[PDB]
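User: Just a sanity check before I run the rest of the batch. Below are the structure tokens for the first item. I only need the designed sequence back.
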């Protein structure tokens, strides 16, 4: 039984937009939860289903997760570095909705800071990193099949599909293109080999 139907959270963000386009082009039936639909593009591949709402609202999340085979999480805070619980509270709602609807696979992006020396996080990113840690804890303790994607700097290099995935935060570089990161999140839908693991995609462009 391959995954066919997925929900993407954070589909309008930098990585979300290209993950969404790639998923639709690849044949998935994609549902997105967006606060503002004007942030979805008109050109290119289009999601099958658009739910307007907020990941902080359980009912909105429930509507989005119902019926899916898997969930991709690309939530983030754009340029806001303030203390925050948006991602972890969103993940709480996602896990509850997954359990309410029988969905058992989640692929979620946090950051390579969760693999690197936890005393080398740049001060201005510490608050966001603390919420990534809370989000990781929520997902790992959910018991669901969870692939933790922990990328380094997200760049705008082209899609290659040729990046390296390690399990410990060491790799050929400290950059992954947004397009390659999205491609990897989709890869995680068709294998179990990363379930229960932390993954570090990187590439020399
Ligand atoms: N930038 C880097 O180099 C880097 C490196 C490693 C890890 N990361 C982490 O990687 C993840 C993905 O980063 P990104 O740059 O692709 O993300 P991003 O551009 O920050 O996009 C965040 C996404 O989350 C959505 N979102 C935020 N609050 C929400 C809410 N309350 N309800 C529903 N959706 C909400 C945003 O929606 P709107 O469009 O409505 O704002 C947007 O779709 C983030 O957690 C980031 O911290 C970033
Ligand atoms: C593991 C890792 C995680 C990162 N996480 C973030 C993050 O959540 N948010 C961010 O703004 N930058 C993060 N960065 C680096 C930023 O993307 C980088 O400072 C960015 O180029 C700043 O661009 P701007 O000034 O246009 O916002 C991360 C880098 C690495 C290696």
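Assistant: Here's the designed sequence for the first item:
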């Amino acid at each position: 039984m391959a995954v066919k139907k997925i929900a993407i959270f954070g589909a309008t963000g930098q990585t979300g937009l290209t993950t969404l386009a790639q998923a639709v082009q690849a044949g998935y039936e994609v549902t997105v939860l967006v606060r503002d639909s004007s942030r979805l593009p008109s050109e290119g591949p289009r999601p099958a289903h658009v739910v307007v709402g907020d990941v902080l609202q359980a009912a909105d999340v429930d509507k989005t997760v119902a019926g899916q085979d898997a969930v991709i999480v690309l939530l983030g805070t754009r340029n806001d570095l303030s203390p925050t619980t948006v991602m972890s509270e969103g993940a709480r709602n996602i896990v509850a909705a997954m359990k309410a609807h029988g969905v058992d696979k989640v692929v979620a992006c946090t950051s390579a800071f969760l693999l690197w020396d936890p005393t080398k996080v740049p001060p201005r990113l510490q608050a966001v990193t603390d919420d990534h840690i809370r989000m990781h804890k929520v997902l790992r303790e959910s018991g669901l099949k969870y692939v933790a994607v922990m990328p380094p700097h997200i760049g705008d290099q082209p899609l290659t599909g040729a990046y390296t995935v390690t399990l410990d935060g060491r790799g050929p570089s400290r950059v992954i293109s947004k397009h390659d990161l999205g491609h990897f999140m989709l890869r995680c839908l068709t294998t179990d080999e990363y379930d229960g693991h932390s993954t570090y995609p990187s590439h020399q462009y």
